[PDB]
Design a protein around this ligand. Structure first.
Ligand SMILES: Nc1nc2c(ncn2[C@@H]2O[C@H](COP(=O)(O)OP(=O)(O)O)[C@@H](O)[C@H]2O)c(=O)[nH]1
Ligand SMILES: Nc1nc(NCc2ccc3c(c2)OCO3)cc(-c2cccc3[nH]ccc23)n1
Ligand SMILES: [Ca+2]
Ligand SMILES: [Mg+2]
Lengths: 423, 67
């Protein structure tokens, strides 16, 4: 039933806010929190993400976290900013200076208890909490360090609930500081241990999509975050609308994750919008499987698919959908592991997103994701072999040993992906 | 994991305090040693001048006992 949403830091809070705008529009909820839709299908499972307050008001089940105030002031002034509950804003003053150790061990620790109090108050009033989703980046200090601290405390107090993240992975092509590879390696180590599902969103890929396909000479953060919000809408559609299926986050996890550590998913979206030509089912199918629509900069022909979910939205022929999904599997069979039968699953929702007649969202558990971690590992090593920029971290109390251990964990994850790719 | 988190934050506190301590003691040693050296320089100069005044007295006491 109920999901609790958490957004931490600058990146996390910008994409989180965009997510709430898009889905609030789909459910017919305006910025004041009043329902003005045309169809009972919009409200029948509204309670998954929204609480009902007095006056038939709908309030997002959302907690907003940062170590500095700036971005949460921008949220509060943003177009839908009044819809969030005021008591759910939890912010410090110091900042974390793009420093994972400040987020995880010093500045963040002072705030974490007050954040957990609000989480507990939201969970306490849930009829039947299914679990949690977190939005954050891995390259900074607050979302990365404090986000993974939060993940650890939530597991300790709610050990049998599902913990899911949408995680933005750094790239030198879109970079704020040189230390991003350190912060990302430290964070992945935590995710391998403490999440059930992590959507890998690579700023490299989002940039290449804006540049090559959508034709934009200077992509802003706003342009990248538009794709992210559309993808997240796609991926939560099956819980959010009456589509026959009787599912919860745990049944989805059981269907998608064959080994506990290999739970990092590659998202995609079709069609890519910045037009009027409607799109045939063959075209949706061909484009959703195309490398160029993937949100993690990995070649799926360089690995094999452990599992795939496809979600189609809009009015279309289910016969034709089945035929096209079968066509792609039968003609490209070598990229799908033979030892998990029937590992491609398909959903259809009648309600299309805003501004499109037909769309498709892709979720892949592919061994080609090892390419992303290798990237990060090389950037890590190039600095760590000379200890460059380490004094920022040891000054907050960390030893070199912790860096060596994190590096080892991530090289092991890569080796595991390779083991299942050669089988 | 929680106990490790406590050890990290305590190590950070400890290093900041140790830096403050060592800078305070280094400064105090320097500012004492400099005072002692300067005072010794001035005391040697004054002592040389007083030895000069003593010699001038022995000279006038030589000229008197000549006559
Ligand atoms: N896609 C995307 N990436 C962002 C955004 N803001 C920051 N980043 C990236 O996230 C990393 C910086 O982390 P940031 O969120 O600013 O740090 P924090 O505030 O301490 O959590 C870098 O890789 C940036 O390129 C955003 O709005 N969208
Ligand atoms: N694992 C997994 N798969 C998904 N895709 C669709 C699907 C349809 C039919 C299926 C199926 C999967 O698996 C077997 O039948 C979405 C999600 C998700 C994640 C995080 C937050 C979420 N809020 C709502 C949903 C969701 N999580
Ligand atoms: Ca403080
Ligand atoms: Mg930043």
């Amino acid at each position: 039933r109920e999901i609790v949403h958490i957004q931490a830091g600058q990146c996390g809070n910008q994409i989180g806010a965009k997510f709430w705008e898009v889905i609030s529009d789909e459910h017919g909820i305006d910025p004041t929190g009043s329902y003005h839709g045309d169809s009972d299908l919009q409200l029948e499972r509204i309670n998954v993400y929204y609480n009902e307050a007095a006056g038939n008001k709908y309030v997002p089940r959302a907690i907003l976290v940062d170590l500095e105030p700036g971005t949460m002031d921008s949220v509060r002034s943003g177009p839908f900013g009044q819809i969030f509950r005021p008591d759910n804003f939890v912010f410090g003053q110091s900042g974390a200076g793009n420093n994972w150790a400040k987020g995880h061990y010093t500045e963040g620790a002072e705030l974490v208890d007050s954040v957990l109090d609000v989480v507990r108050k939201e969970s306490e009033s849930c009829d039947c909490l299914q679990g949690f989703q977190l939005t954050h980046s891995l390259g900074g200090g607050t979302g990365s360090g404090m986000g993974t601290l939060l993940i650890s405390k939530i597991r300790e107090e709610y050990p049998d609930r599902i913990m899911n993240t949408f995680s933005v992975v750094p790239s030198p092509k879109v970079s704020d500081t040189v230390v991003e590879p350190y912060n990302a390696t430290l964070s992945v180590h935590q995710l391998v241990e403490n999440t059930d599902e992590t959507y890998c969103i690579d700023n490299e890929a989002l940039y290449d999509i804006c540049f090559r396909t959508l034709k934009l000479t200077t992509p802003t953060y706003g342009d990248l975050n538009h794709l992210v919000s559309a993808t997240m809408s796609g991926v939560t559609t099956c819980l959010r609308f009456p589509g026959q299926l009787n599912a919860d986050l745990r049944k989805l996890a059981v269907n998608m994750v064959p080994f506990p550590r290999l739970h990092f998913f590659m998202p995609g979206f079709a069609p890519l919008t910045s037009q009027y030509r409607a799109l045939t089912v063959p075209e949706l199918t061909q484009q959703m499987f195309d490398a160029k629509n993937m949100m993690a900069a990995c070649d799926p022909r360089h690995g094999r698919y452990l599992t795939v979910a496809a979600v189609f939205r809009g009015r279309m022929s289910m016969k034709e959908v089945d035929e096209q999904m079968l066509n792609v599997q039968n003609k490209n069979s070598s990229y799908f592991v033979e030892w998990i039968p029937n590992n491609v699953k398909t959903a259809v929702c009648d309600i299309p997103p805003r501004g499109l007649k037909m769309s498709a969202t892709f979720i892949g558990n592919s061994t080609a994701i090892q390419e992303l971690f290798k990237r990060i590992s090389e950037q890590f090593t190039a600095m760590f072999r000379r200890k460059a920029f380490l004094h920022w971290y040891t000054g907050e109390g960390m030893d070199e040993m912790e860096f060596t251990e994190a590096e080892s964990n991530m090289n092991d994850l890569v080796s595991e992906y390779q083991q299942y790719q050669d089988a | 994991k929680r106990e490790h988190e406590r050890e990290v934050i305590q190590k950070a506190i400890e290093e900041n305090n140790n830096f403050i301590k060592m800078a305070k003691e280094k400064l105090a040693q320097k500012m004492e040693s400099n005072k002692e050296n300067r005072e010794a320089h001035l005391a040697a100069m004054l002592e040389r001048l007083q030895e000069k005044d003593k010699h001038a007295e022995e000279v006038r006491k030589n000229k008197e006992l000549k006559e």
